[PDB]
C-alpha cells in the first residue's frame, strides 16, 4: 500500500506513535517519508547483506528474521514479511521496540539525515487528526 501524507500521519497516530518516546507525529511522518515514500512494500538491501523492510525499512540484521540474514536477531520477533502489510501494526510495534533501544530515533539513517532538527510539523500540516 502507498499511503497518502495525513492517511499514515492518522494510521502512526491510532497506533499510538505520535509523541511516543517524545517524537511527535511529523517525525515518524518525516522519517516514512524518506525511508520507504510511504510505501509499505518498500524492501532494499544493505552492502552488508542485510534488508531493511516495510514503511519504516526495518533492517533483517536486528529486529526481524527473513532467513538469509546471517548472524542476525530478530528483536521484534516477527518475520521480516509482516513488516511489508498494508496494515502498519507490525511495523509501528517494532518501530517502537527500536526508539526505545537507546539512540531514540537516530536507528534510523534517514531521520538523522533528513528530518532531525527541520520543521516536522509541516509534515502534519492540514491533516485531520
Ligand atoms: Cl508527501
Ligand atoms: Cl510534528
Ligand atoms: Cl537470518
Ligand atoms: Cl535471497
Ligand atoms: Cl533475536
Ligand atoms: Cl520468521
Ligand atoms: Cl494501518
Ligand atoms: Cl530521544
Ligand atoms: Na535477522
Known amino acids: 500500500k502507498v499511503f497518502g501524507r495525513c492517511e499514515l500521519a492518522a494510521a502512526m497516530k491510532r497506533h499510538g506513535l505520535d509523541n511516543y518516546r517524545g517524537y511527535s ?3 515518524w511522518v ?8 510511504f510505501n509499505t512494500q518498500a524492501t532494499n538491501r544493505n552492502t552488508d547483506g542485510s534488508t531493511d523492510y516495510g514503511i519504516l525499512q526495518i ?6 528474521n527473513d532467513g538469509r540474514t546471517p548472524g542476525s536477531r530478530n528483536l521484534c520477533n516477527i518475520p521480516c514479511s509482516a513488516l511489508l502489510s498494508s496494515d502498519i501494526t507490525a511495523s509501528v510495534n517494532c518501530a517502537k521496540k527500536i526508539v526505545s533501544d537507546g539512540n531514540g530515533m ?3 539513517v534517514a531521520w538523522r539525515n533528513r528530518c532531525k532538527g527541520t520543521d516536522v510539523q509541516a509534515w502534519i500540516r492540514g491533516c485531520r487528526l
Not at 518525516?30 to 515514500?37: D, H, I, R, V
Not at 533492517?59 to 526481524?64: E, G, T
Open 30 to 37: 518525516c522519517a516514512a517519508k524518506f525511508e520507504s515514500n
Open 25 to 27: 507525529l511529523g517525525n
Open 106 to 108: 537516530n536507528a534510523w
Open 59 to 64: 533492517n533483517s540484521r536486528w529486529w526481524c
